Amino acid sequence: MEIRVFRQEDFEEVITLWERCDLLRPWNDPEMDIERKMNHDVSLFLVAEVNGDVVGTVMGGYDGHRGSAYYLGVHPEFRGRGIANALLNRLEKKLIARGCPKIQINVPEDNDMVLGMYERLGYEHADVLSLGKRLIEDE
Amino acid sequence: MEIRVFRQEDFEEVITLWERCDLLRPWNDPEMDIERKMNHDVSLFLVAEVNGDVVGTVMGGYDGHRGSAYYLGVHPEFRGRGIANALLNRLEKKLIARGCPKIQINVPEDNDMVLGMYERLGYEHADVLSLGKRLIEDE
Ligand SMILES: CC(=O)SCCNC(=O)CCNC(=O)[C@H](O)C(C)(C)COP(=O)(O)OP(=O)(O)OC[C@H]1O[C@@H](n2cnc3c(N)ncnc32)[C@H](O)[C@@H]1OP(=O)(O)O
Ligand SMILES: CC(=O)SCCNC(=O)CCNC(=O)[C@H](O)C(C)(C)COP(=O)(O)OP(=O)(O)OC[C@H]1O[C@@H](n2cnc3c(N)ncnc32)[C@H](O)[C@@H]1OP(=O)(O)O
């Protein structure tokens, strides 16, 4: 099992993996989200490869004050093997390697399995409200 | 009134301002936060100057997927002038200019004023839980 940075050749496999992980949302064009990362900085956008195939990903990121993580997914047939953990742990190390002091992640207030996963990894709930404003609309 | 990017010469004036705005937190070394931004990309770290002095700031950011904003502060004697609004607006334009599709901001749960400011500026609530994990501690 090997964790590495996303490459242009992984483009379609990654999207298909997102489809299978139910990570796609109508308001976020996945082609656009990948192109944004490619143009901005691909280095924290990781994939997990097992026997040559991409079976997991995490779109990590850093803005100069806090790290982030979106599109965390592991293919259904490859779950319960510690891949998401491996992914998150590698991101955290890449983040620390460049001076990132903290990582923040937003999770659906509904998903308990994911909430639990983050808690076991040492993440704690922040007493804040998350607000947002769309700047460029996707289709 | 002029909004522009943070300059090294602004360092002590900004920290002093942050103290005056009660933005400092023990777990965040302000000097360290400024250096992180300088090393990563200073371009979205904006200051507002009036009559030659820095009277407002916003530490904007972009990670390749979402925009962010920290350290939003306006000197107490310069409030109710639209300075905070102008800082956020300019940050939004800079975000859009580089392709950022959306900005997110977490607000303390009980800060009614700030929550109201953002809603009034067109930011909507996300039904999500913010989780965080400290990666490098500041002393
Ligand atoms: C940034 C984000 O979080 S985006 C939102 C993430 N949500 C999704 O991606 C939804 C789709 N789901 C998935 O892709 C996968 O189920 C993931 C990413 C949630 C989990 O991936 P996996 O590789 O199975 O995780 P991994 O094997 O590292 O498991 C991590 C923990 O979750 C636990 N876990 C995995 N599946 C389940 C389950 N069905 N029920 C309860 N716990 C589970 C594991 O037991 C493990 O905990 P442990 O360390 O205490 O054993
Ligand atoms: C990333 C972050 O958010 S960091 C956390 C932010 N919070 C803090 O910094 C706490 C310290 N507070 C401050 O420094 C200032 O009070 C700020 C930055 C919140 C606001 O500064 P100001 O320059 O006064 O805000 P500005 O004048 O642009 O007002 C923005 C909008 O919110 C409303 N608002 C803000 N404060 C008030 C107030 N005391 N009374 C009425 N309306 C207010 C304004 O009415 C305005 O809309 P308007 O067009 O109706 O006037």
Question: How are the secondary structure elements laid out?
Answer:
The structure is a homodimer of 139-residue chains.
Chain A: E1 2-5, H1 11-20, H2 30-40, E2 45-50, E3 53-62, E4 67-74, H3 83-97, E5 102-108, H4 112-120, E6 124-125, E7 128-134
Antiparallel strand pairs in A: 1-2, 2-3, 3-4
The structure holds acetyl coenzyme *A (ACO) (2 copies).
The site of one acetyl coenzyme *A (ACO) has 21 residues of chain A, from β4, α3, β5 and α4.
Structure, explained:
Chains A, B: It holds the Pfam family Acetyltransf_1. Chains A, B: One of its GO terms (molecular function) is acyltransferase activity, transferring groups other than amino-acyl groups. Chains A, B: InterPro entries: Acetyltransferase_YpeA, Acyl_CoA_acyltransferase, Bact_Acetyltransf, GNAT_dom. Chains A, B: It is an enzyme of class 2 (transferase). Chains A, B: Belongs to the acetyltransferase family. YpeA subfamily. The structure is a homodimer. In chain A, a hairpin with a 2-residue loop joins strand 2 and strand 3. The first copy, chain A, has one domain: Aminopeptidase (3-Layer(aba) Sandwich). The first copy, chain A, has a 4-stranded antiparallel β-sheet with strand order 1-2-3-4. Chain A is an alpha+beta fold and about 140 residues long. The longest helix of chain A has 15 residues. At the A-B interface, helix 2, strand 3, strand 4, helix 3 and strand 5 of A face helix 2, strand 3, strand 4, helix 3 and strand 5 of B. The site of one acetyl coenzyme *A (ACO) has 21 residues of chain A, from strand 4, helix 3, strand 5 and helix 4.
